[PDB]
């Protein structure tokens, strides 16, 4: 897997719909290792391809796959407000669901 | 190594240089035969290079205007027809066209 990250930020959508554009997919670490690679190549806070859109509490990928490693900042996921349902990367690493509709950076992952 | 992906959309160079850019790549430059020919892989039609001659005609150079060396024309071309072509393609059979920077062409996009 190569990893590239977005100069802008955007939402979840767009986001997707930049990857998607080059053939590729929202980042989804699998193990620790391509969680700090991803890490390494964003610059802020950015969005991965996981999300609990389809049933809440349940994170998967963006092609249905339910994730097994997952790195969750402390307290996290809370679904906080009207819900998070996306997935965001901070700068320490860990992560953080937020709404979908919120803009952050966007890492790409091709193979 | 030098990473080569191709858009599946069609856009003119300026939207093609500001897409690679997006995720800090650069409009695709072959430096010799087998950049052209990864590229031919990724390129399902007709795709877009990083190279111009819009300073100078028949001056191509890259897009950060570093006058190439490696060159692979396909007969007839550089031809710059009608108004001018001064943006480069990659055909389908790896050779290069020269074709107007405002018509649109899918895009391949390089990283290192
Ligand atoms: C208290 O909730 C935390 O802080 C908020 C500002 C949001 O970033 C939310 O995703 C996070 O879990
Ligand atoms: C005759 O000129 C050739 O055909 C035209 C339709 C254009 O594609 C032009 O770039 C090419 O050199
Ligand atoms: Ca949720
Ligand atoms: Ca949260
Ligand atoms: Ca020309
Ligand atoms: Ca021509
Ligand atoms: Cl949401």
Redesign the pocket.
Known sequence: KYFMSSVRRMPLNRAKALCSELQGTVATPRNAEENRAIQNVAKDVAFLGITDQRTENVFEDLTGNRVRYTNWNE??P?N?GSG?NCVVLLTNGKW???PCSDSFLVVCEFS
Request: hydrophobic share 25%; net charge negative; glycine share 12%.
């Open positions: 307290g996290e809370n906080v998070e953080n669901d937020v």
